Amino acid sequence: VRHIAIPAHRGLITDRNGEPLAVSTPVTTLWANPKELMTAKERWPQLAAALGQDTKLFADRIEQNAEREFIYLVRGLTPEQGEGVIALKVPGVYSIEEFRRFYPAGEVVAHAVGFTDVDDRGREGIELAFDEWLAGVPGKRQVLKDRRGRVIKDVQVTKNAKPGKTLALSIDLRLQYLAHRELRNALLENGAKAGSLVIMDVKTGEILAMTNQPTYNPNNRRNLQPAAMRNRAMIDVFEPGSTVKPFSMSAALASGRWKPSDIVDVYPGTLQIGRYTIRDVSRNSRQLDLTGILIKSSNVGISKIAFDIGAESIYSVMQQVGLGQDTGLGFPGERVGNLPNHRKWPKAETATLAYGYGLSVTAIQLAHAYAALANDGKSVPLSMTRVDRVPDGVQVISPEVASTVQGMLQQVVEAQGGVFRAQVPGYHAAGKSGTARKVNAYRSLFAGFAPATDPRIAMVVVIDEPSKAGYFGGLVSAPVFSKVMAGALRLMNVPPDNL
């Protein structure tokens, strides 16, 4: 008499609308008692054939395990294939009924959902993070064996298996599909190495979509590079560059010393700070109002504002909206990044902070920060699960500064010489481009939200090493935001505010 495991049914993972993302399917494991097999050698070759094993390698194996009462023959056949080889009636060949994950959306949601191992344990993504909730508790059954390992009776069930619990993700499979296709299309269109796209509900903290390129089929994980398994939206850190300028502007408008119509002189489009040189791409400007600084992405303009208000006020807004701060999702391998702090801020670091140099963030943090700005300065906690009861937000930017900065980002998108590729047919949209030279090689960024009049959705597009002549965020990333924001607002029945 021994006690042996009854595997629990692993909980269904669904999208927010109940569409299956991870399903436990019944499969059959074959095992053999070698001590029984050793009395039916004439049966081995037929049994070897049936397992697609070679006659002599199979016989070498049984011989080598002749002292044992258990070995695995094969794991995870269908119930039909399993029943096919049990029907050969080979002494000492036995059937365990098991569960195996199937992922109906495959590579589309692989980074978020993750996978289980052959033992049905969660090892990546949601499968790992919610493993206790999904696995349930195994059962035990009492099994009498004769003295040479022959299973005879099933004496009783000692303890019943408790099933796993259903888990509904925040992901909307319809937005996930749209996000997946358009990031793939832009990646191919730009000969890009990698990229990420994140969509947030600005009101609920919910991640409606999270896709990366490259991806992999979790149903077929054989001969698979690590690179394609990385959930880059959460585990990759990058410099966000000029996409942080709206947080600098937030500190400027909250200081009491700046309003949108104020002028900064950026001539000649450079500014020497000790040994270091601050440089604009476009160097044909003198006076720029604060909206112009964002439209022309003048590093010199935001630097002079940063000198006047102090890095401390800028650091604080960036810390508050979650840049380089723990998200608290508890997701495997999640990076925090780095928001550098100083006891006393020097000049050079005051400027670089203000335009997103020497800062490290995730696509998720950047999306969360834009979510807070869109939701009138209120940060709602992030969830990867369906939110039925929305937790209270924290007011991180005053509602009036948030509303002024939204208006300015609406201008970045809609005004003359603005980022017109980010415009969303039938809607007012708002956002900020960025371009990071990595240490030539570029990262193209667009972060924004829509509709501008009552924000619903925040979105970040990161394309890593576009290899065509176009590398600027406004060229590469902005058109992706456009197509994916259009489809997302329509799938979510958001009334057009620009008709």
Active site residues per annotation? 242
Counting every residue written for the chain, the total comes to 499
Helices 245-254 and 311-320: crossing angle in degrees, nearest 10, is 120
Q: Using CB under 6 A as the criterion, which residues of the chain lie in contact with ligand R7G when the complex forms?
A: 239, 241-242, 281-282, 297, 299, 355-357, 433-437, 472-474
What's the CA gap between 106 and 111, in Å, rounded?
10
- Closest separation in Å from C-beta 446 to ligand R7G: 8
Tokens of 330: 């508890």
State the nearest-atom distance from the C-beta of 286 to ligand R7G, in Å: 16
Minimum Å distance from CB 15 to ligand R7G? 33
Min. distance of Cβ 431 from ligand R7G in angstroms? 10
Place of tokens 């206790």: 132
Q: Which is nearer to ligand R7G, 7 or 431 (CB)?
A: 431
Which amino acid makes up residue 308? D
Which residue's C-beta sits nearest to ligand R7G? 242
Least separation in angstroms between residue 99's CB and ligand R7G is 47
Phi, psi of 177 (to 5 degrees): -65, -50
Token pair listed for 468: 């065509």
Q: At what angle do helices 245-254 and 347-354 cross, to 10 degrees?
A: 110
**Considering the complex, what minimum distance in angstroms separates the CB of residue 273 from ligand R7G?**
14
Q: How far is the CB of 185 from ligand R7G (least distance, A)?
A: 20
Q: Would you say 183 or 475 has its CB closer to ligand R7G? A: 475
Closest contact distance (angstroms) between CB of 444 and ligand R7G is 7
Nearer to ligand R7G, 356 or 448 (CB): 356
Query: What distance lies between CA 66 and its chain's CA centroid?
Result: 49
Residue 82 carries which side chain, given as an amino acid letter? G
The least distance separating ligand R7G from the CB of residue 430, rounded to whole angstroms, comes to 14
- Rank residues 148 and 437 by Cβ distance to ligand R7G and give the closer one: 437
Contact 321, 379 (CB under 8 A): yes
Are 224 and 216 in contact, with CB atoms under 8 Å apart?
yes
